[PDB]
Amino acid sequence: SMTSHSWLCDGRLLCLHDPSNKNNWKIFRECWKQGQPVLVSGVHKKLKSELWKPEAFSQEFGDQDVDLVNCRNCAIISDVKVRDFWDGFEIICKRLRSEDGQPMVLKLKDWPPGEDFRDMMPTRFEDLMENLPLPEYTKRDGRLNLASRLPSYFVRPDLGPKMYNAYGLITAEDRRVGTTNLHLDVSDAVNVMVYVGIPIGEGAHDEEVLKTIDEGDADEVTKERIHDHKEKPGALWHIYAAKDAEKIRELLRKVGEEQGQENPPDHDPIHDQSWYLDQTLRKRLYEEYGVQGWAIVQFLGDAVFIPAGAPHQVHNLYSCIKVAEDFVSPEHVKHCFRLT
Ligand SMILES: Oc1c(F)cc(F)cc1[C@H]1CCNN1
Ligand SMILES: [Cl-]
Ligand SMILES: [Cl-]
Ligand SMILES: [Cl-]
Ligand SMILES: [Cl-]
Ligand SMILES: [Mn+2]
C-alpha cells in the first residue's frame, strides 16, 4: 500500500517513504543539489524500540552528573543526576518544579558528552548507524561523505552521533520559545526522531499542540498525518535556504535595535543562537525581506536532512529523543571551506 515518495510544504519538500530503498538517491539528489531540506519517514520501524526508551536511559546511566537548561528563561541547572531529567520525561508529577510550583520545561545539555556516544552506548551506536537513510551520504565511510577525505582548508565535523533530549513546550506563552534557537551548521546533518513521550498528569494537553502547528504555518497534508493516521508528532522545525541567511541577519539586527539591544552593525545574530522566530517575526521576514521558509513537523521515525549553511530552529510539541549525524556531501562542501 506504499509509494516511493510524496510532497509536503505544497510541493516544496520531498518526503521519502521507505528508509532502506536502494533507489532513494535518484529522487533525493536533485532536491538536495537545489539546497532543499528532505524528510524520510519510517526509520522507527527499522530500530530496536527497547534501546530508545527513557526508562532504559535512567536505569543504565542515571548516576552520571549533568547540567540542564530551563527552556523558558535559559537558566542553567548545574551538576544534577541525569535520572532527575529522565524520570520526569513523561510523568509530570516527577518533573522538577519552578519556585512557583509549575512542572518545568528542561533540555538535557551535551549528553552523552562531546564525542563519547559510541564508547558509552555501543549497541545504540550500531542500531542507529546501520539504519540511517541515504547511507552513501550519511555513514562515516560512505562514498559521498567527504568528512574523512578533506584537508585542513575545510572545517571537519566532530565524530557523532549527538543525542538531543528535551521536554515538550506546554503553554500559550511557551508558543514563542525555542527548544533549539535559530542557528546554522557548516556541515550537512540528518536528525532522527527515535522516541516521542506524550505525558500523563497534565495529560489532556492535546489542544494547545493543534493551535501551535496551525500558527506554525504547517501545510494541510501535515495536518492530515495527526487526524487521519494518528502518528505521534514530536517537534516543529522552521528551515531557511542558505542563500537567505544574510537577509535573516538584517531582520534580527533591526529587531535587536528596536528592542534596545546595543550591538555593532556587523554582529552575527544567527551565530549568537539567541533568537526564536515566532509567528510575528516569521511574517515580518516574509513581508519586509521576501524570505519564505519550510515549516516541518517531525513525527516519530522521521529523519530530517538539514543542508549545510541553512538557518534552522526547533520547537518540541512533546518530550523528544532525537539522534543526529553530521556529514559532508559534495553538493554543499563550499559551506565549510576556510577561504574566499
Ligand atoms: O520503496 C518503494 C516501495 F516500497 C514501493 C514502491 F512502489 C517503490 C519504492 C521506491 C523507493 C525508491 N525507489 N523505489
Ligand atoms: Cl548550498
Ligand atoms: Cl548501548
Ligand atoms: Cl545513498
Ligand atoms: Cl539553543
Ligand atoms: Mn544544529
CSV table of C-alpha atoms and ligand atoms in Angstrom, one decimal:
chain,number,residue,atom,x,y,z
A,1,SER,CA,0.0,0.0,0.0
A,2,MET,CA,3.1,2.3,-0.2
A,3,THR,CA,4.5,4.6,-2.9
A,4,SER,CA,8.3,5.6,-3.3
A,5,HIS,CA,7.5,9.3,-2.1
A,6,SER,CA,5.2,12.3,-1.7
A,7,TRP,CA,5.4,16.1,-1.3
A,8,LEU,CA,4.9,18.3,1.8
A,9,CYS,CA,5.1,22.2,2.1
A,10,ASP,CA,2.8,22.4,-1.1
A,11,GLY,CA,5.3,20.6,-3.4
A,12,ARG,CA,8.5,22.3,-1.9
A,13,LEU,CA,9.6,19.4,0.4
A,14,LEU,CA,10.4,15.8,-0.7
A,15,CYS,CA,9.1,13.0,1.6
A,16,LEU,CA,10.7,9.6,1.0
A,17,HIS,CA,8.6,6.6,2.4
A,18,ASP,CA,11.0,3.6,2.5
A,19,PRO,CA,14.2,4.4,4.5
A,20,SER,CA,16.2,1.4,3.1
A,21,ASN,CA,15.1,1.6,-0.6
A,22,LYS,CA,18.4,1.3,-2.6
A,23,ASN,CA,17.0,3.7,-5.3
A,24,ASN,CA,16.3,6.7,-2.9
A,25,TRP,CA,19.4,8.6,-4.1
A,26,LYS,CA,17.8,9.0,-7.6
A,27,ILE,CA,14.9,11.1,-6.2
A,28,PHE,CA,17.0,12.7,-3.3
A,29,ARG,CA,20.0,14.1,-5.2
A,30,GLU,CA,18.1,16.7,-7.4
A,31,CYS,CA,16.2,18.2,-4.4
A,32,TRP,CA,19.5,18.2,-2.4
A,33,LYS,CA,21.6,19.9,-5.1
A,34,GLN,CA,19.0,22.8,-5.1
A,35,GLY,CA,19.6,23.4,-1.3
A,36,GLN,CA,16.3,22.0,-0.1
A,37,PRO,CA,15.8,20.0,3.1
A,38,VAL,CA,14.3,16.5,2.8
A,39,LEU,CA,12.2,14.2,5.1
A,40,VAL,CA,12.4,10.4,5.3
A,41,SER,CA,9.6,8.6,7.2
A,42,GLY,CA,9.6,5.1,8.9
A,43,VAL,CA,13.1,4.9,10.4
A,44,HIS,CA,11.5,3.8,13.8
A,45,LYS,CA,10.2,0.5,12.2
A,46,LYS,CA,13.9,-0.3,11.4
A,47,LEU,CA,15.3,0.2,15.0
A,48,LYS,CA,15.2,-1.9,18.2
A,49,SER,CA,12.4,0.0,20.1
A,50,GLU,CA,13.6,-1.2,23.6
A,51,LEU,CA,17.1,0.6,23.2
A,52,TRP,CA,15.4,4.1,22.8
A,53,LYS,CA,13.1,4.3,25.9
A,54,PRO,CA,13.6,7.0,28.6
A,55,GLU,CA,13.3,4.3,31.4
A,56,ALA,CA,16.3,2.3,30.0
A,57,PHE,CA,18.5,5.5,29.8
A,58,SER,CA,17.6,6.3,33.5
A,59,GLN,CA,18.3,2.6,34.7
A,60,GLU,CA,21.7,2.4,32.8
A,61,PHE,CA,23.2,5.9,33.1
A,62,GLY,CA,21.1,7.6,35.9
A,63,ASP,CA,24.1,8.2,38.2
A,64,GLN,CA,26.0,10.4,35.8
A,65,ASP,CA,26.4,14.2,36.6
A,66,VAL,CA,25.0,16.7,34.0
A,67,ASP,CA,23.7,20.3,33.6
A,68,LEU,CA,20.1,21.0,32.4
A,69,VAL,CA,18.6,24.2,30.7
A,70,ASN,CA,15.3,25.8,31.7
A,71,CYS,CA,13.9,26.3,28.1
A,72,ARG,CA,11.5,29.2,29.3
A,73,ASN,CA,14.3,31.5,30.6
A,74,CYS,CA,17.7,29.9,29.6
A,75,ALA,CA,18.7,29.4,33.3
A,76,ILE,CA,21.3,26.6,33.8
A,77,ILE,CA,20.6,23.9,36.5
A,78,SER,CA,24.1,22.8,37.4
A,79,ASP,CA,25.6,19.4,38.4
A,80,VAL,CA,22.4,17.3,39.0
A,81,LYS,CA,22.0,13.5,38.3
A,82,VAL,CA,20.8,12.5,34.8
A,83,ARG,CA,17.9,10.4,36.4
A,84,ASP,CA,16.5,13.8,37.7
A,85,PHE,CA,15.9,14.6,33.9
A,86,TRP,CA,14.8,11.1,32.6
A,87,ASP,CA,12.4,10.3,35.5
A,88,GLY,CA,10.3,13.5,34.7
A,89,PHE,CA,10.4,12.9,30.8
A,90,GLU,CA,6.7,11.7,30.5
A,91,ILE,CA,5.4,11.6,34.2
A,92,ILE,CA,4.7,15.3,35.0
A,93,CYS,CA,4.3,14.7,38.9
A,94,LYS,CA,8.1,13.7,38.9
A,95,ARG,CA,9.3,16.7,36.8
A,96,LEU,CA,11.4,19.2,38.7
A,97,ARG,CA,9.1,22.2,39.6
A,98,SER,CA,9.9,26.0,39.5
A,99,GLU,CA,10.0,28.0,42.8
A,100,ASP,CA,6.3,28.8,42.0
A,101,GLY,CA,5.4,25.0,41.7
A,102,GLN,CA,5.0,24.5,37.9
A,103,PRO,CA,6.3,21.4,36.1
A,104,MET,CA,9.4,22.9,34.3
A,105,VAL,CA,10.4,22.6,30.6
A,106,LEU,CA,14.0,21.2,30.6
A,107,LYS,CA,16.6,20.3,27.9
A,108,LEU,CA,19.5,17.9,28.8
A,109,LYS,CA,22.7,19.7,27.8
A,110,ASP,CA,25.6,17.8,25.9
A,111,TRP,CA,24.7,14.2,26.8
A,112,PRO,CA,26.3,11.9,26.0
A,113,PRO,CA,29.2,14.5,26.3
A,114,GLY,CA,31.5,15.6,23.3
A,115,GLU,CA,32.3,12.6,21.1
A,116,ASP,CA,31.5,9.9,23.8
A,117,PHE,CA,28.2,8.4,22.3
A,118,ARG,CA,30.0,5.4,20.7
A,119,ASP,CA,32.1,4.5,23.8
A,120,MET,CA,29.1,5.0,26.3
A,121,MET,CA,26.4,3.3,24.1
A,122,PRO,CA,28.0,0.9,21.5
A,123,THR,CA,24.7,-1.1,20.9
A,124,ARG,CA,22.7,2.2,20.3
A,125,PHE,CA,25.5,3.4,18.0
A,126,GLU,CA,25.3,0.2,15.9
A,127,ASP,CA,21.4,0.2,15.8
A,128,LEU,CA,21.4,3.9,14.5
A,129,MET,CA,24.3,3.8,12.1
A,130,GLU,CA,23.1,0.5,10.3
A,131,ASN,CA,19.6,2.0,9.8
A,132,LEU,CA,20.4,5.7,8.7
A,133,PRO,CA,18.7,6.5,5.3
A,134,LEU,CA,20.9,7.6,2.2
A,135,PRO,CA,23.8,5.6,3.6
A,136,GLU,CA,26.4,6.7,0.8
A,137,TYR,CA,25.9,10.2,2.2
A,138,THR,CA,25.3,9.6,5.9
A,139,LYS,CA,27.7,6.7,7.0
A,140,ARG,CA,31.1,7.7,8.4
A,141,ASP,CA,32.8,6.0,5.3
A,142,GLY,CA,30.0,6.4,2.7
A,143,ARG,CA,31.3,7.1,-0.9
A,144,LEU,CA,29.5,10.6,-1.0
A,145,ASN,CA,30.6,11.7,2.6
A,146,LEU,CA,33.8,13.8,2.2
A,147,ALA,CA,34.2,14.3,6.0
A,148,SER,CA,37.1,11.8,6.4
A,149,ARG,CA,38.7,12.8,3.0
A,150,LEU,CA,39.2,16.6,3.3
A,151,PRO,CA,42.4,18.6,4.2
A,152,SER,CA,42.6,21.3,6.9
A,153,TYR,CA,41.4,24.0,4.5
A,154,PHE,CA,37.9,22.6,5.4
A,155,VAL,CA,36.1,22.6,8.8
A,156,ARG,CA,35.5,18.9,9.6
A,157,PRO,CA,32.6,17.8,11.8
A,158,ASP,CA,33.2,16.1,15.2
A,159,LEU,CA,32.7,12.3,15.4
A,160,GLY,CA,29.0,11.7,16.2
A,161,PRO,CA,26.3,10.9,16.6
A,162,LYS,CA,24.9,13.5,19.1
A,163,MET,CA,21.7,13.0,21.2
A,164,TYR,CA,19.2,15.9,21.7
A,165,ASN,CA,16.8,15.3,24.6
A,166,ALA,CA,14.2,17.8,25.9
A,167,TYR,CA,10.7,18.0,27.3
A,168,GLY,CA,7.7,19.4,25.3
A,169,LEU,CA,6.7,23.1,25.5
A,170,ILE,CA,3.3,23.3,27.1
A,171,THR,CA,1.5,26.7,27.5
A,172,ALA,CA,0.3,29.5,25.1
A,173,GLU,CA,3.3,31.7,26.4
A,174,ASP,CA,5.6,28.7,25.5
A,175,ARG,CA,4.5,29.1,21.8
A,176,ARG,CA,7.2,31.8,21.3
A,177,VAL,CA,10.1,29.9,22.9
A,178,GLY,CA,12.6,27.5,21.1
A,179,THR,CA,13.9,24.1,22.2
A,180,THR,CA,16.9,24.9,19.9
A,181,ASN,CA,17.2,28.6,18.8
A,182,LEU,CA,17.9,29.8,15.3
A,183,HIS,CA,21.4,28.8,14.1
A,184,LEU,CA,23.3,27.3,11.2
A,185,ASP,CA,25.9,24.5,10.8
A,186,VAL,CA,28.8,24.4,8.3
A,187,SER,CA,28.3,20.6,7.7
A,188,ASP,CA,25.1,18.7,6.5
A,189,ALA,CA,23.2,16.7,9.1
A,190,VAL,CA,20.5,14.0,9.4
A,191,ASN,CA,18.3,14.2,12.6
A,192,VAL,CA,16.2,11.0,13.5
A,193,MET,CA,13.2,11.2,16.0
A,194,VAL,CA,13.7,7.8,17.9
A,195,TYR,CA,11.1,8.4,20.7
A,196,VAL,CA,8.1,10.7,21.5
A,197,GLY,CA,6.8,10.9,25.1
A,198,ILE,CA,3.2,12.1,25.3
A,199,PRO,CA,2.6,12.7,29.1
A,200,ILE,CA,0.0,11.9,31.8
A,201,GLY,CA,-0.7,14.1,34.9
A,202,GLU,CA,-1.3,17.2,32.9
A,203,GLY,CA,-2.4,14.7,30.2
A,204,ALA,CA,-5.3,16.3,28.2
A,205,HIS,CA,-2.7,18.9,26.8
A,206,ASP,CA,-3.6,17.9,23.1
A,207,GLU,CA,-5.4,21.2,22.3
A,208,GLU,CA,-2.5,23.8,22.5
A,209,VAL,CA,-0.4,21.4,20.3
A,210,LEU,CA,-3.0,21.9,17.4
A,211,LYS,CA,-3.0,25.7,17.7
A,212,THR,CA,0.9,25.6,17.6
A,213,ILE,CA,1.0,23.6,14.4
A,214,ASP,CA,-1.6,25.8,12.7
A,215,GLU,CA,0.1,29.1,13.7
A,216,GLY,CA,3.4,27.4,12.9
A,217,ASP,CA,2.3,27.7,9.2
A,218,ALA,CA,2.2,23.8,8.7
A,219,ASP,CA,0.6,22.6,5.3
A,220,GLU,CA,-2.8,20.8,5.0
A,221,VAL,CA,-1.2,17.3,4.3
A,222,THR,CA,0.9,17.6,7.6
A,223,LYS,CA,-2.3,18.4,9.5
A,224,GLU,CA,-3.9,15.2,8.0
A,225,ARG,CA,-1.0,13.0,9.5
A,226,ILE,CA,-2.5,13.7,13.0
A,227,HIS,CA,-6.3,13.4,12.5
A,228,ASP,CA,-6.2,10.5,9.8
A,229,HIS,CA,-3.2,8.2,10.7
A,230,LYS,CA,-2.8,9.0,14.5
A,231,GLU,CA,1.1,9.2,14.2
A,232,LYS,CA,2.9,10.9,17.2
A,233,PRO,CA,4.1,14.5,16.4
A,234,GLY,CA,7.5,15.3,18.1
A,235,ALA,CA,8.8,18.7,17.1
A,236,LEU,CA,8.0,21.8,14.8
A,237,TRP,CA,11.0,22.9,12.7
A,238,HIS,CA,11.5,26.1,10.6
A,239,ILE,CA,14.3,25.8,8.0
A,240,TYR,CA,15.5,28.6,5.6
A,241,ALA,CA,17.7,28.3,2.5
A,242,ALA,CA,21.5,29.0,3.0
A,243,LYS,CA,21.1,31.8,0.3
A,244,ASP,CA,18.7,33.8,2.7
A,245,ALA,CA,20.9,33.8,5.8
A,246,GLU,CA,22.2,37.4,5.3
A,247,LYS,CA,18.6,38.8,4.9
A,248,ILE,CA,17.7,37.0,8.2
A,249,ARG,CA,20.7,38.7,9.9
A,250,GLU,CA,19.4,42.1,8.6
A,251,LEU,CA,15.9,41.5,10.1
A,252,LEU,CA,17.4,40.4,13.5
A,253,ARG,CA,19.8,43.4,13.7
A,254,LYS,CA,16.7,45.8,13.1
A,255,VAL,CA,14.7,43.9,15.7
A,256,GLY,CA,17.6,43.9,18.2
A,257,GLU,CA,17.9,47.7,17.8
A,258,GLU,CA,14.1,48.2,18.2
A,259,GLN,CA,14.2,46.1,21.4
A,260,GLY,CA,17.0,48.4,22.8
A,261,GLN,CA,19.9,45.9,22.4
A,262,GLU,CA,23.2,47.8,21.6
A,263,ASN,CA,25.1,45.7,19.0
A,264,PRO,CA,27.7,46.7,16.4
A,265,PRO,CA,26.4,46.9,12.8
A,266,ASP,CA,28.4,43.7,11.8
A,267,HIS,CA,27.5,41.4,14.8
A,268,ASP,CA,26.0,37.9,13.8
A,269,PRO,CA,22.6,37.2,15.4
A,270,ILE,CA,22.4,33.8,13.8
A,271,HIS,CA,25.9,32.7,15.2
A,272,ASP,CA,24.7,34.1,18.7
A,273,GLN,CA,21.9,31.4,18.8
A,274,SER,CA,19.8,33.8,20.9
A,275,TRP,CA,16.7,34.2,18.7
A,276,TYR,CA,13.5,32.1,18.1
A,277,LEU,CA,11.4,33.3,15.1
A,278,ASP,CA,7.8,33.4,16.5
A,279,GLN,CA,4.7,34.0,14.2
A,280,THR,CA,5.2,37.8,14.3
A,281,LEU,CA,8.9,37.5,13.2
A,282,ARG,CA,8.2,34.9,10.5
A,283,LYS,CA,5.5,37.1,9.0
A,284,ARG,CA,7.9,40.2,9.1
A,285,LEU,CA,10.7,38.0,7.4
A,286,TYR,CA,8.2,37.2,4.5
A,287,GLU,CA,6.6,40.7,4.2
A,288,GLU,CA,9.7,43.0,4.7
A,289,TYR,CA,12.5,40.9,3.3
A,290,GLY,CA,10.7,38.5,0.8
A,291,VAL,CA,12.0,35.3,2.5
A,292,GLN,CA,9.9,32.1,2.7
A,293,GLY,CA,10.9,29.0,4.8
A,294,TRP,CA,9.9,25.4,5.3
A,295,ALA,CA,7.7,24.6,8.3
A,296,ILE,CA,8.2,20.9,9.1
A,297,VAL,CA,6.5,18.6,11.7
A,298,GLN,CA,8.9,15.8,12.6
A,299,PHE,CA,6.9,12.7,13.7
A,300,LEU,CA,8.2,9.5,15.5
A,301,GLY,CA,10.6,7.8,13.0
A,302,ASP,CA,11.0,10.9,10.7
A,303,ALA,CA,14.6,11.7,9.6
A,304,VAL,CA,15.1,15.5,8.7
A,305,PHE,CA,18.0,16.3,6.3
A,306,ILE,CA,19.3,19.9,7.0
A,307,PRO,CA,21.6,21.3,4.3
A,308,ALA,CA,25.0,23.0,5.3
A,309,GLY,CA,24.5,26.8,5.8
A,310,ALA,CA,20.7,26.6,6.2
A,311,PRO,CA,19.5,28.6,9.3
A,312,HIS,CA,17.0,26.4,11.4
A,313,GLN,CA,15.2,26.3,14.7
A,314,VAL,CA,13.3,23.6,16.6
A,315,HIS,CA,10.2,23.7,19.0
A,316,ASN,CA,9.3,20.4,20.8
A,317,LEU,CA,5.5,19.8,20.9
A,318,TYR,CA,6.0,16.8,23.2
A,319,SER,CA,9.0,15.2,25.0
A,320,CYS,CA,11.6,14.1,22.3
A,321,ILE,CA,14.7,11.9,21.9
A,322,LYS,CA,16.5,12.9,18.7
A,323,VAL,CA,19.8,11.5,17.4
A,324,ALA,CA,21.8,13.3,14.7
A,325,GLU,CA,24.8,12.6,12.5
A,326,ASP,CA,26.9,15.3,10.7
A,327,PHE,CA,28.3,14.6,7.1
A,328,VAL,CA,29.9,16.5,4.2
A,329,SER,CA,28.1,16.0,0.9
A,330,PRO,CA,29.9,17.1,-2.3
A,331,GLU,CA,26.8,19.3,-3.2
A,332,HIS,CA,27.5,21.6,-0.2
A,333,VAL,CA,31.3,21.3,0.6
A,334,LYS,CA,31.6,25.1,-0.3
A,335,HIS,CA,29.9,25.9,3.1
A,336,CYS,CA,32.9,24.5,5.2
A,337,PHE,CA,35.9,25.9,3.0
A,338,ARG,CA,38.1,28.4,5.1
A,339,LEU,CA,39.0,30.8,2.2
A,340,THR,CA,37.2,33.4,0.0
B,1,LIG,O1,10.4,1.7,-1.5
B,1,LIG,C1,9.4,1.6,-2.5
B,1,LIG,C2,8.3,0.8,-2.2
B,1,LIG,F1,8.2,0.2,-1.0
B,1,LIG,C3,7.3,0.7,-3.2
B,1,LIG,C4,7.4,1.2,-4.4
B,1,LIG,F2,6.5,1.0,-5.3
B,1,LIG,C5,8.5,2.0,-4.7
B,1,LIG,C6,9.6,2.2,-3.8
B,1,LIG,C7,10.7,3.1,-4.3
B,1,LIG,C8,11.5,3.9,-3.2
B,1,LIG,C9,12.6,4.5,-4.1
B,1,LIG,N1,12.6,3.8,-5.2
B,1,LIG,N2,11.6,2.6,-5.0
B,2,CL,CL,24.1,25.5,-1.0
B,3,CL,CL,24.3,0.7,24.4
B,4,CL,CL,22.6,6.6,-0.7
B,5,CL,CL,19.6,26.8,21.7
B,6,MN,MN,22.1,22.3,14.6
